[PDB]
From a paper:
In this study we present cryoelectron microscopy (cryo-EM) structures of the ribosome from A. baumannii in complex with the clinically relevant antibiotics amikacin and tigecycline, solved to high resolutions of 2.8 and 2.6 Å, respectively, allowing comparison with previous apo structures of the A. baumannii ribosome (Morgan et al., 2020). The overall structure comprises a large 50S subunit, composed of 23S rRNA, 5S rRNA, and 28 ribosomal proteins, and a small 30S subunit composed of 16S rRNA and 20 ribosomal proteins. These constituent parts form the recognizable structural elements of the ribosome, including the central protuberance, L1 stalk, and L12 stalk of the 50S subunit, and the head, body, platform, shoulder, and spur of the 30S subunit. Therefore, for each structure, the 50S subunit, the body of the 30S subunit, and the head of the 30S subunit were treated as three independent rigid bodies and their reconstructions refined to nominal resolutions of 2.7, 2.9, and 3.0 Å for the amikacin-ribosome complex and 2.5, 2.7, and 3.0 Å for the tigecycline-ribosome complex, respectively.
Additional density for tigecycline was also seen in the 50S at the central protuberance. Here, three tigecycline molecules bind in a cavity between the 23S rRNA, the 5S rRNA, and protein bL27. This is accommodated by a significant conformational change of the surrounding rRNA, with a particularly large movement by U2308 (G2319) of the 23S rRNA, which flips out to interact with the 9-t-butylglycylamido moiety of one of the molecules. The three molecules interact with one another through stacking interactions and through bridging magnesium ions, as well as with the backbone and bases of the surrounding rRNA and protein bL27 (the three molecules labeled 1, 2, and 3). From the 23S rRNA, a carbonyl and a sugar ring oxygen of U2308 (G2319) form polar contacts with the 9-t-butylglycylamido moiety of tigecycline 1, the base of A2309 (U2320) forms a pi-pi stacking interaction with ring D of tigecycline 3, and the base of A2322 (A2333) forms a carbon-pi interaction with a methyl group of the amine of ring D of tigecycline 3. Finally, the main-chain carbonyl and Cγ of Gln74 of bL27 form van der Waals contacts with the amide of ring A and ring B of tigecycline 2. Additional interactions between the tigecycline molecules and the surrounding phosphate rRNA backbone are facilitated by coordination of magnesium ions, most clearly seen by the ion that bridges the phosphate of 23S A2309 (U2320) with oxygen atoms of ring A of tigecycline 2 and rings B and C of tigecycline 3. Protein bL31, which also forms part of bridge B1b, is partly resolved in this tigecycline-bound structure but much less well resolved in the amikacin-bound structure, so it appears that these conformational shifts make bL31 more rigid.
Residue numbers in the entry:
A (entry chain Z): 1 to 44
B (entry chain A): 2 to 273
RNA sequence: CGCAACCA
RNA sequence: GCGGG
RNA sequence: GGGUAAGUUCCGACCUGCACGAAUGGCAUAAUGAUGGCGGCGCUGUCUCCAGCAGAGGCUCAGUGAAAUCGAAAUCGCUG
RNA sequence: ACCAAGGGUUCCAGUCCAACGUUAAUCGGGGCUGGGUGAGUCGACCCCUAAGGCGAGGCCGAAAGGCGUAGUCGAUGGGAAAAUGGUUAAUAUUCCAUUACUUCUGUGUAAUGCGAUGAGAGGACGGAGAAGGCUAAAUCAGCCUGGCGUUGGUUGUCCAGGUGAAAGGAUGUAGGCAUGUAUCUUAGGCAAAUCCGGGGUACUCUAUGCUGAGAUCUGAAAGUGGUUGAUGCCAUGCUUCCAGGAAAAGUCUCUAAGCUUCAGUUACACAGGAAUCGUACCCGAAACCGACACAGGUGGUCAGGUCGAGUAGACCAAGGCGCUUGAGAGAACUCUGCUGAAGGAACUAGGCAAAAUGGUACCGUAACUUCGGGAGAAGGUACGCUGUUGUUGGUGAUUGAGCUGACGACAGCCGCAGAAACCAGGCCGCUGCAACUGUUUAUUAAAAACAUAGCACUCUGCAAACACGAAAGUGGACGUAUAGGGUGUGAUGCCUGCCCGGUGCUGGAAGGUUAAUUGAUGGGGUUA
């Protein structure tokens, strides 16, 4: 069967990347939350 | 005119095609075409705003001169051409100084014929004139509504309007819908009827022919569930409801014109 | 007979 | 509570 | 009525239509359908009624090694 | 076998076997140690743009923000240039050899107008089909080298192996396209133009230019001919059809501005450069997506022989593998197959499943039909090998040899069977439903359901109806009533009766009833 992941690094970086998160208020709140938790990776 | 196809397969039995031996077989005039991408009926927000739209052949937009603002210069017809964007044919005019333009072809216009614009233009099919200088009872097409804007009315393949009579700064014309309207006499019209004129005798013959024109299939609201259409639901076939649109507007006879700004220009509407 | 008013 | 019969 | 030795199905009729019916279309229709029903020729292990044989498991040996379940068990029949 | 994606060292070598590997393991995609990826030409970066995104100002919005102009990004598309051979344990169009090519710099020499952010041309493009010319490739022959056969024969008309150097340069053919040239002139090209477009003349249309596969020449132990022949190339060509088939830059022409004896341009010569990143390895996979070394999934490219229409199929080549538990035994029972007396659907809800049919050529083929079909209807005949004899086609050494395709006629030979294995329609009669091809419940429903061409009703006069959105605005549509939206019906044939009381809708407006508003009257409270 064809499964749901189907990787593509360009699409990953354009949907969930750092600059994609920094481009909106909600994504910057995502970044603030993950810094508050102390995550070692902020984004994909 | 119209050619019926032999039933050599079930999808050909009812294909009535329109055939014109005088249309230019070849590439359009390249300086006058531009790209025209398909919308799918999606707006700014990416939402579908017009259903049943999508697919179809790739098409270029031909730049048709609707304003005809090159007055006093005679022009000669080079060729009549297929225009995928509309139902009428277009004529490629070569003006007397070398400029090339596209216009909506009149009914009997052929290669080699001469057209002109302005106040002085003779009465001749394809000549653009202000409604002051048109004779009463004439058959017109490509009619302005605002001064200087360009032809807006009677542009489809067999369209034409009747000039019924001028009184003051307004000529009264009759439209194809059966409606009597007034237009400022400074608006321009073109003499004659629009070209193609057997466009409505064709028969697509099969579903794929409609798909080639960018039409997607229509689903009846009767065939839906209540969550999707006000006609939806029911055990078996049921339409126990006054017919209505997907958004709940009545579909048989209910009038939807609400523009009060231009109502004083309508002398007599249809249905009278 | 209809139109409209109804918060023990 | 306003008209009709 | 036909078809079968024998037909609640099928086909053709009849009309007493519980409760058909004309664009929630009526009645037909060549072609088409992995569409529903019925019949026939061929062909057969579908069957009468199963027999033999081939390979793969099963079984025994060596190696590795699960699962659901589980109150505890010294966990038979019959009649009540 | 090779790429992209994805992975990320799994690649190679030495060493180790606890764990991992569905068993053992000395082995490994496991552990430890070391090594390995070489580019002006390959790809990316870069220049250019599509869909789309972001978007100075701007418009809109309680705020957050939304849309969008100028612009700026964004490949899945456009834009320079390399071949052959050799080499490592592991890289090679990258290293080496040989022979090329592209584009930049400078430094000169000789000539002299250079020209943009503007204008024009070009890049620039669909489906299908066909004829030809070619080439790769394959095969046979020739040539070179070796061989003389465990068992009859094998010094030949025998056996086996090997053996055809590319890019590039020159040349400019088969083919394809445009009539070209000169001169005068000019309501166009945001202003200019010697340029493009438009006019007029004279000669030309057995003329000029562009383009162009391949051949030839060159490169440069055997190393040369034939046949067949592409899906590759000419060819972004040609013909035809309608549903009418990206953009921008690089490129070329022109002038504006600006310079001017310079700078810039272009011809040549000399010298020097072409950065950066990727490059190992895996690709129907044990390395990617599926929790696994998982019978699944994964885009593109290459793809030989015999027979064959074929990329089907059987057996093989190159290449790669034996699928990471085996050994016995040969019970019931289960699975997967093969055969089966006599019968032949009696089975069963139901011929479910199996069996059967099956190729090529020729003969023959009903009802019905929308004249196309039905139809491969149904059904029947022949088919192997050997020899003899005929017609014919294609290439074309020297008109026509050698090689090769097609079609027959006779005669014989053999078997149970000649379509020999593999491969490869079962058919017919009556009937309901849906015209038809399509679509659908990913994962128990493929259908009579949905759609459909056609039909009808209705709305819509354009700042359209309608939809999305808070608005700005966007779609409808760069469309204009032969159009667009909604609703039902559903090819076609013949047709489609009656009812306007109810509920809708459309028209009408005499009267009744009726909101905010307005505030006449009357009543009260206060007290000079
Ligand atoms: Mg529609
Ligand atoms: Mg439903
Ligand atoms: Mg509802
Ligand atoms: Mg019902
Ligand atoms: Mg029965
Ligand atoms: Mg009914
Ligand atoms: Mg009726
Ligand atoms: Mg009805
Ligand atoms: Mg029976
Ligand atoms: Mg006991
Ligand atoms: Mg290894
Ligand atoms: Mg072990
Ligand atoms: Mg290892
Ligand atoms: Mg924006
Ligand atoms: Mg701003
Ligand atoms: Mg860019
Ligand atoms: Mg790309
Ligand atoms: Mg390697
Ligand atoms: Mg094509
Ligand atoms: Mg011997
Ligand atoms: Mg770089
Ligand atoms: Mg490699
Ligand atoms: Mg493989
Ligand atoms: Mg799984
Ligand atoms: Mg395995
Ligand atoms: Mg696998
Ligand atoms: Mg095969
Ligand atoms: Mg038997
Ligand atoms: Mg028998
Ligand atoms: Mg029975
Ligand atoms: Mg029985
Ligand atoms: Mg069956
Ligand atoms: Mg079978
Ligand atoms: Mg159907
Ligand atoms: Mg189907
Ligand atoms: Mg499906
Ligand atoms: Mg299902
Ligand atoms: Mg199913
Ligand atoms: Mg229906
Ligand atoms: Mg019908």
């Amino acid at each position: 069967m064809k499964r749901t992941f189907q990787p593509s690094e360009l699409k990953r970086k354009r949907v969930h990347g750092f600059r994609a998160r920094m481009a909106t208020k909600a994504g910057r709140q995502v970044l603030a939350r993950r810094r508050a938790k102390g995550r070692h990776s902020l984004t994909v | 005119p119209i050619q019926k196809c032999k039933p050599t397969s079930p999808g050909r039995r009812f294909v009535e095609k329109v055939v014109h031996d005088h249309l230019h077989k070849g590439a359009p005039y390249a300086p006058l075409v531009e790209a025209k991408k398909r919308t799918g009926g999606r707006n700014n927000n990416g939402h579908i705003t017009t259903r049943h739209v999508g697919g179809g052949h790739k098409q270029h937009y031909r730049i048709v001169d609707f304003k005809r603002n090159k007055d006093g210069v005679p022009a000669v017809v080079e060729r009549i051409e297929y225009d995928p964007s509309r139902t009428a044919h277009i004529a490629l005019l070569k003006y007397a100084d070398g400029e090339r333009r596209y216009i909506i072809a009149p009914k009997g216009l052929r290669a080699g014929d001469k057209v002109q614009s302005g106040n002085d233009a003779p009465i001749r099919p394809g000549n653009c004139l202000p409604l002051r200088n048109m004779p009463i009872g004439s058959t017109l097409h490509n009619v302005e509504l605002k001064i200087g804007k360009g032809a807006q009315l009677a542009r489809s393949a067999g369209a034409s309007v009747q000039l019924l009579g001028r009184d003051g700064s307004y000529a009264i014309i009759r439209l194809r819908s059966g409606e009597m309207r007034k237009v400022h006499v400074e608006c321009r019209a073109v003499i004659g009827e629009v070209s193609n004129q057997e466009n409505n005798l064709r028969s697509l013959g099969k579903a794929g022919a409609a798909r080639w024109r960018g039409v997607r299939p229509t689903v009846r609201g009767m065939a839906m569930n209540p969550i999707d259409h006000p006609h939806g639901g029911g055990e078996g076939r049921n339409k126990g409801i006054q017919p209505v649109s997907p958004w709940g507007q009545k579909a048989k006879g209910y009038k939807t014109r609400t523009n009060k700004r231009t109502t004083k220009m309508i002398i007599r509407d249809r249905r009278v």
